[PDB]
Subunit: 260 residues, 2 copies
């Protein structure tokens, strides 16, 4: 056996740098939901591993011109990593080039507003211009709007793609900061899981409104045909059935909430 | 190519017999969410099919003594059917003998009460005896309680397994009828999807209370190693991404609701 290389991404509260990480070594430098999940998966599958942060800090997309895959998906496709354990959305285009376990978390696209903003739904956003709105610049949320045939979402994409200045952000933290510093003039579309986490963090000035726009899940990914695929899938099902996944979400989202 | 044999189960609103089914033929005898889903999957995967109702009317369990699998799972394992398209829960023990697509629907175990019953949670049920409660006699809901290590659910299973008369029912319709005819002295534990459907059907005397006890999903199943597996999985992802699955749930659950 050989040490398994795990690729993941810095995204709270899935993977975060510990306070004195600069003086720590190996897997000890990180903490979070996916760090805990990686330890459980490795134990039940019988392997040793090394956590690494994706080089380009992206989730995974295919360049239309070069046909090259970037992000965590790219690291698996080109053999730079053996497995990805992160909040990676299961999608058709990705399933065609890598394998995914059954979902370890369920979620959907949602709306985040600065408290007091006069918006209650996607419909509301699409019918006005005073309040700007956008999504992560690369990922499944942006693709959802780009390819949607649904009236409201199609109208939203038409606005977002031409809006100036750009309404797209580089990271989740950037989107949250923009909502907080825009005095209610910017609303952010992001996955419900991240929205729910931020709502319980100081300065407690944001909130999730309306229902989710869709339904999907995050899965553990492996290179197509990997010998680890089968065991990892069974491990995810085992951990969910014994209540470990629910325990971990409570641990990183609510047990330590800062807003009451 | 050969006609694909689909096994499914009579469970509203997934698969139901049309009014004059006795005078109809083939796939035309049935209607419902899974009937519509089967047509879409077959079209996108390029195959012709024949719908059949599982012989023993069960979902799928393995006899501890004979080691024989029954229900829809059994039909796939022994080669009596080529694919199962029904509200079949993705579980570890089943994943070990058959293949599942990514989920086409997300759900969780829930509580159904006759309106007015003084119960608001699983905790409430576990701390009293006046109001009896049970689950489907065979399936993932019963297994959840049987194998749970969680205090409240463990206390609930201890009560249910010895309760007299039996608190377990043969079908969902039987459980609903018992709730309706017991004057509030029987509460039923069932999947949220079925609970949500019944709440919108006359005589509009039931309701779902509390949150779900767990989180899981339904998947399309095929015999392990089947050549249909890959295409069926991609088709489920395609249908979810284009909004067809959400449209179908609204069509069979809410568009025709009977309770306002
Ligand atoms: N999980 C996504 C990435 N991602 C993350 C947060 C968010 O709000 N939107 C999004 O697309 C993916 O896998 O691309
Ligand atoms: N989907 C289940 C069957 N099933 C259906 C309804 C319900 O309330 N509980 C249950 O276990 C399975 O696959 O066993
Ligand atoms: Zn463990
Ligand atoms: Zn279609």
């Amino acid at each position: 056996n050989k040490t398994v290389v795990v690729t993941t991404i810095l995204e709270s509260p899935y993977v975060m740098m510990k306070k004195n990480h600069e003086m720590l070594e190996g897997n000890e430098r990180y903490e979070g939901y996916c760090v805990d999940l990686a330890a459980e998966i490795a134990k039940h599958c019988g392997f040793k591993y090394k956590l690494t942060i994706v080089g380009d800090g992206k989730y995974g997309a295919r360049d239309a011109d070069t046909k090259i895959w970037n992000g965590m998906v790219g690291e698996l496709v080109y053999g730079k990593a053996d497995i990805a354990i992160a909040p990676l959305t299961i999608t058709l285009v990705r399933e065609e080039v890598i394998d995914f376990s059954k979902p370890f978390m369920s979620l959907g696209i949602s709306i985040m507003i600065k408290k007091g903003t006069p918006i209650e739904s996607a419909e509301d956003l699409s019918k006005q211009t005073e309040i700007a709105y956008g999504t992560l610049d690369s990922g499944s949320t942006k693709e959802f709007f780009r390819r949607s045939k649904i009236a409201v979402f199609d109208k939203m994409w038409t606005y977002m793609r031409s809006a100036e200045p750009s309404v797209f952000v580089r990271t989740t933290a950037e989107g949250v900061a923009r909502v907080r510093k825009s005095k209610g003039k910017y609303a952010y579309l992001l996955e419900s899981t991240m929205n729910e986490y931020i709502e319980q963090r100081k300065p407690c000035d944001t909130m999730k409104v309306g229902g989710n726009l869709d339904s999907k899940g995050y899965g553990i990914a492996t290179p197509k045909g990997s010998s680890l695929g089968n065991a990892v899938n069974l491990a995810v099902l085992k951990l969910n059935e014994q209540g470990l996944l629910d325990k971990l979400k409570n641990k990183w989202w609510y047990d330590k909430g800062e807003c009451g």
